[PDB]
Amino acid sequence: IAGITQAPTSQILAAGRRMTLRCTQDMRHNAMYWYRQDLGLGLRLIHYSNTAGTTGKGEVPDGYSVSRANTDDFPLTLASAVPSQTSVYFCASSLSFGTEAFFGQGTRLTVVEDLNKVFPPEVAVFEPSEAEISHTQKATLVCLATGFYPDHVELSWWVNGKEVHSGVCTDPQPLKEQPALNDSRYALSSRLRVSATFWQDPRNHFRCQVQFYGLSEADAWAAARAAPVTQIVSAEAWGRAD
Amino acid sequence: MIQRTPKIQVYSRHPAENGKSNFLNCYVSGFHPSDIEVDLLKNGERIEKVEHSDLSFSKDWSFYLLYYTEFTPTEKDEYACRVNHVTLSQPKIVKWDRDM
Amino acid sequence: KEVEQNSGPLSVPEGAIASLNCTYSDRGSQSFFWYRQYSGKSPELIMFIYSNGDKEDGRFTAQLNKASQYVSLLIRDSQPSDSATYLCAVNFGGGKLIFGQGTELSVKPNIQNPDPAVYALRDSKSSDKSVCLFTDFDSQTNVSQSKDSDVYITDKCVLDMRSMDFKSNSAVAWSNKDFACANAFNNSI
Amino acid sequence: GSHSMRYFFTSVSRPGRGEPRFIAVGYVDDTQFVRFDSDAASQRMEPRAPWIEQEGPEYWDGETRKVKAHSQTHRVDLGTLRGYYNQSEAGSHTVQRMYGCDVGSDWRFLRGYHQYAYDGKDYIALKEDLRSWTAADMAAQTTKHKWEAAHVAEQLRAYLEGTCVEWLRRYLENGKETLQRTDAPKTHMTHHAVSDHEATLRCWALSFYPAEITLTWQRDGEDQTQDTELVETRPAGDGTFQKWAAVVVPSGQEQRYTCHVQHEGLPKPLTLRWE
Amino acid sequence: SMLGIGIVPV
């Protein structure tokens, strides 16, 4: 049960605000690390710590700071949120310096200049094509999550209230609907495919679930729009017969 | 805790020649703990400009240090080494004997 | 420059030996690591190595040569589950554990009976769009997008009906126009 | 001939004075080449031999991070060992660590060491097979079980059999003019009177490298030792060493006492007698 | 070159 845990798992920061990412491990590890990973390169070392009570500077320590008051905790604090700090942050630990590092779940952090630009996705389930059933005896269900910013989304399919993992593939990265704004919404596609003897059953229920990580209650929402907080938006479809 | 008293040796780097530059050495070894105070004396007074090596220890975990300074020996001038340590109730003086 | 990995992405056929290499600048490095990172997940350790020579663990074999300052990883019988980004980590003393840029590995699946087709799907009436489906293509075919930038196409996508022993590539296209699922193409069909 | 590389670490707690002191030194044979002093201002690994200055910044940055990691580890040990032995917080205590490797005349691995002491007494040591430990007392059994679960011996063995001998051969090649030299001793004898009916015969050996040398006194052919004073080999300050051996002989029995010295800079063991 | 591994608190 001993492991390393990061918190929070997702966060949307307004520019200029301070933020602290939590990391704790109960494996009695002496060394801990903080990394950032952007979609353009690999992992870059921010800060490290060899033992409790000491810290060190990594590859890109500028703009970050850490403390190591005890063996278990190693918080990463952002002084002033800058859009260049938008990345995925991984905390790691090793038994001692030089040994293998065990990574945490990671934290998806996005620093936006304004909180009015956050939008939840819109989900739609498209029914299979008449030719697909006739040709292939297969039935593809395509899901489109559109109009969400940022790309803090997790898509999944559910058949009869149970999550399926066979016959499903999702786009690895969400697609920019307007690549000429650098603050535009995203789109995500996914397909779920079953036999013709399954889509033609009118008993069966299909649902495309999109978990969206948006604002939080402590965040101040003062606008003329429904709050785009962390929520789940789903679209469904029932199998036809003919 | 078991302590070790220092062994003291005072000598020159090169054979002593009157009027020729040389180095006066005081080698302390076999002591524990590592905290020690070493002065090199000229006619009983402190030599201020004295250097020492970096602390290391032997197989029996006892430490050793080399204190050294540049000097020119003469017939009249006397030299010695003064060492204080927790094992010593008073500073111990070892005289430089070039005829050893 | 400190840690340079194989520059990808590397396309490896199913069952072929995937070779990954990694060079480092600090000749005094004493520990080396290979991690596996799936898309949107955490790096998982494959194996560590401390000494010159080979080290084997199942289908994975690492090789370290401090004189040449390289560490390599060979993956035999490349399964579809091996498709991920492989990270190389080198310790530069103390806590300076540095990673390379990572090598994306794509194990291409074998589509036994390619059945290319461009279908049109009607929405549930909950939304109001229309999508086109490039599906059942041979794994050699690749897709690209955007005749009129106001259209959207995704890259190819391999799904696996694990109870039918069946796999197929998939691509989706949609837009807001006087649309036609016939002209959604630009690539080799 | 055979060579060795060793690192010596000393950590001393200073409760009534301040923060702990940490001193690290590295040796190739009897020649120190690097050092670190926590009380110094640079806070860096510093060169102490001319042939090590050619190492690039990745070496000095890497050794500095590692020597700081050693010091930070010993700083934790001071508090832990103070608890293991139920010692008060007002006393000064010492942690010492030594490790290294020996190579033969072919520069191939011979033996590896890793010894750890507390307050000048053995605490835990890596055995010669580089796979097991010797715990000095019952409080050290906790450390032994902890290091075995962490596979410390496997990591030390990879260094002692690999990294240690590889850098040792590199050092011996970069400092061939210094490390691979053999300075022959320069011997002479002195004589003085102890008391009536007694005299002193001292056998000197000066300016020799390496520090290994054996001086024995003999009587008209036989090994008459254990009645003699043997001073320990001492440094001269210029990379060479000194040593003397003196025997107490009657005022007339002088020319029946031989001193036999042997140094790898001497083709055959030397002998001397008074006058 | 000193140890980069195997240094663990007692």
How many CB atoms are closer than 10 A to CB B48? 8
Q: Which of D108, D111, D114 is nearest to D166 (CA)?
A: D108
Q: Which of C35, D72, D86 is nearest to A71 (CA)?
A: D72
For A217, residues 6+ apart whose C-beta sits below 8 A from its C-beta are A229
**Mutant choice from D66, D70, D166, D171 vs C, greatest count of C C-beta within 10 A:** D66
- Structural domain spans, chain B: 1-100
The whole domain housing A48 covers 1-113
Contact indicator for A239, A159 with CB cutoff of 8 Å = no
Q: What whole-number distance in Å separates Cα of residue C173 and Cα of residue C120?
A: 9
Q: Tell me if there are at least 3 CB pairs under 8 Å linking chains B and C.
A: no
Give me the amino acid identity at D231.
V
Q: What whole-number distance in Å separates Cα of residue D54 and Cα of residue A2?
A: 46
- DSSP helix/strand/coil, D143: helix
- Do A102 and A159 lie in a common domain? no
d(CA C20, nearest CA chain D) in Å: 24
Q: Which helix (H) or strand (E) holds A2?
A: none
Q: C-alpha distances in angstroms, D109 versus B1, C52, D101, D106, D241?
A: 37, 15, 7, 9, 27
The reply to whether C9 touches chain A by the CB within 8 Å rule is no
Which of chain A's residues have a Cβ under 8 Å away from the Cβ of E5? 96-99
DSSP for residue D224: -
Burial of A214 (C-beta count, 10 Å sphere; 0-12/13-18/19+): buried
- Could you tell me which chain D residue has the CA closest to the CA of B30? D232
Which of chain E's residues have a Cβ under 8 Å away from the Cβ of D84? 10
- Do C116 and C185 lie in a common domain? yes
Q: Which of C22, A56, A94 is nearest to D61 (CA)?
A: A56
Give Cα A151 distance to the centre of its chain.
7
How many CB atoms are closer than 10 A to CB C131? 24
For B48, residues 6+ apart whose C-beta sits below 8 A from its C-beta are none
List, as ranges, residues 84-143 from C with C-beta within 8 Å of E.
91, 93-94
The reply to whether C96 touches chain A by the CB within 8 Å rule is yes
Output the six-digit token pair for B15: 């054979």
- Matching fold, domains D1-181 and D182-270: no
The reply to whether A27 touches chain D by the CB within 8 Å rule is no
Give the A:C interface size as CB pairs under 8 Å: 160
Check which CATH number belongs to the domain holding A74 and give it: 2.60.40.10
Check which CATH number belongs to the domain holding C89 and give it: 2.60.40.10
Place of tokens 């006492």: D257
- Do A109 and A127 lie in a common domain? no
CA geometry: angle at A85 spanning A82 and A90, to 5°?
Answer: 150
Q: What whole-number distance in Å separates Cα of residue C64 and Cα of residue C52?
A: 5
- Do C68 and C133 lie in a common domain? no
CA geometry: angle at D40 spanning D63 and A96, to 5°?
Answer: 35
Burial of A165 (C-beta count, 10 Å sphere; 0-12/13-18/19+): exposed
Question: D7–E2: do the CB atoms touch at under 8 Å?
Answer: yes
The whole domain housing C166 covers 110-189
- DSSP helix/strand/coil, D140: helix
Q: C-alpha distances in angstroms, C81 versus A69, C17, C39, C90, C107?
A: 41, 14, 12, 25, 8
| Architecture of the domain delimited by D1-181 | 2-Layer Sandwich (3.30)
- Do C114 and C101 lie in a common domain? no
Which of these three, A87, A113, A139, is where a domain ends?
A: A113
Which of these three, C109, C137, C172, is where a domain ends?
A: C109
What Rg, from alpha-carbon coordinates, does chain D have? 23
A195-201 contacts, C-beta under 8 A, 24 or more apart? A195/A137, A195/A138, A195/A139, A195/C161, A195/C164, A196/A133, A196/A137, A196/A138, A196/A139, A198/A139, A198/A239, A199/A128, A199/A133, A199/A139, A199/A141, A199/A239, A199/A240, A200/A133, A200/A139, A200/A239, A200/A240, A200/A241, A200/A242, A201/A239
| Architecture of the domain delimited by D182-270 | Sandwich (2.60)
Question: D61–C92: do the CB atoms touch at under 8 Å?
Answer: yes
Q: What whole-number distance in Å separates Cα of residue B41 and Cα of residue B64?
A: 20
Q: What whole-number distance in Å separates Cα of residue A173 and Cα of residue C157?
A: 12
Minimum-distance CB partner of D32 among B30, B54, B100: B54
Question: C154–A167: do the CB atoms touch at under 8 Å?
Answer: no
Which of chain D's residues have a Cβ under 8 Å away from the Cβ of C50? 154-155, 158-159, 162
Q: What whole-number distance in Å separates Cα of residue C137 and Cα of residue A130?
A: 19
Q: Which of C112, C88, C93, C109 is nearest to C23 (CA)?
A: C88
Output the six-digit token pair for C21: 């290499």
List, as ranges, residues 1-10 from E with C-beta within 8 Å of A.
4-9
Question: D75–A53: do the CB atoms touch at under 8 Å?
Answer: yes
Chains that touch B (3 or more CB pairs under 8 A): D
Contact indicator for C69, C27 with CB cutoff of 8 Å = yes
Buried b (16+ CB within 10 A) or exposed e, A108-141: bbbbbeebeebbbbbbbbbbbbeebbeebebbbb
Q: What whole-number distance in Å separates Cα of residue D215 and Cα of residue D237?
A: 21
Chains that touch D (3 or more CB pairs under 8 A): A, B, C, E
Output the six-digit token pair for D166: 């590889």
- Do A93 and A125 lie in a common domain? no
CA A168, A173, A179, A183 dihedral sign is positive
In angstroms, how far is the first alpha carbon of chain D from the final one?
35
Output the six-digit token pair for C188: 């080799």
- Do C160 and C72 lie in a common domain? no
Output the six-digit token pair for D229: 């004073």
Minimum-distance CB partner of D69 among A53, A95, A97: A97
Question: A97–E9: do the CB atoms touch at under 8 Å?
Answer: no
Contact indicator for A20, A82 with CB cutoff of 8 Å = no
List, as ranges, residues 1-10 from E with C-beta within 8 Å of C.
1, 3-5
Output the six-digit token pair for B25: 């050495």
Place of tokens 């120190």: D32
- Do C126 and C90 lie in a common domain? no
For A238, residues 6+ apart whose C-beta sits below 8 A from its C-beta are A202, A204, A205, A206
Place of tokens 């055959």: D268
Question: A54–D72: do the CB atoms touch at under 8 Å?
Answer: yes
| Architecture of the domain delimited by B1-100 | Sandwich (2.60)
- DSSP helix/strand/coil, D98: strand
Buried b (16+ CB within 10 A) or exposed e, C147-165: eeeebbbbbbbbbbbeeee
- Do C100 and C37 lie in a common domain? yes
Contact indicator for C63, C19 with CB cutoff of 8 Å = no
- Could you tell me which chain A residue has the CA closest to the CA of E4? A98
Place of tokens 């660590």: D97
Q: Tell me if there are at least 3 CB pairs under 8 Å linking chains A and C.
A: yes
Which of chain D's residues have a Cβ under 8 Å away from the Cβ of B6? none
- Do C77 and C115 lie in a common domain? no
- Do C129 and C165 lie in a common domain? yes
Q: What whole-number distance in Å separates Cα of residue D28 and Cα of residue D9?
A: 15
For A198, residues 6+ apart whose C-beta sits below 8 A from its C-beta are A139, A204, A239
Give me the amino acid identity at D18.
G
What Rg, from alpha-carbon coordinates, does chain C have? 21
Q: How many domains does chain A have?
A: 2
Contact indicator for A105, C97 with CB cutoff of 8 Å = no
Q: How many domains does chain C have?
A: 2
Which of chain A's residues have a Cβ under 8 Å away from the Cβ of C43? 43, 90, 103
How many CB atoms are closer than 10 A to CB B25? 22
Please state the φ and ψ torsions of residue D66, each to the nearest 5 degrees. -75, -40
The reply to whether A50 touches chain D by the CB within 8 Å rule is yes
List, as ranges, residues 136-155 from C with C-beta within 8 Å of A.
136, 149, 152, 154-155
- Do C105 and C182 lie in a common domain? no
- Do A109 and A145 lie in a common domain? no
Minimum-distance CB partner of A127 among C41, C124, C162: C124
Q: C-alpha distances in angstroms, D64 versus B12, C26, D160, D232?
A: 35, 14, 20, 33
Contact indicator for D48, D124 with CB cutoff of 8 Å = no
- Do C12 and C67 lie in a common domain? yes
